[PDB]
Symmetry: none
Subunit: 64 residues, 2 copies
């Protein structure tokens, strides 16, 4: 009936609105996860580089 | 019409099901982010600690 349809329509508008909010939130959370995963990666290869230069410093002083 | 009603109904079902997919997906991502944020703090304190003894090691050798 026309009334049932108008209820379904109203419900569908609300669900689409909620889906937009949910997608937005998923998108932010997901970006944040990505950035954090890069930061952990960038700090590791940074840290490795640093340790190599550390050991090298020790050597510069162990071999004169 | 009854055709329209049946389409709206099908769409309503799909939207409710997708809403659950999105909620779970969000909950998982949020948990993963939580873990990665902890790893960032871990990574940080390691890298900074390393960097500090490196700067100290450099300072000890520097005066001309």
């Amino acid at each position: 009936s026309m009334d049932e349809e108008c209820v379904l329509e109203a419900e569908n508008k609300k669900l689409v609105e909620d889906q937009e909010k949910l997608k937005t939130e998923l998108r932010k959370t997901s970006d944040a996860l990505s950035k954090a995963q890069n930061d952990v990666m960038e700090m590791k290869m940074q840290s490795e580089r640093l340790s190599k230069e550390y050991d090298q410093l020790l050597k510069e002083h162990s071999e004169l």
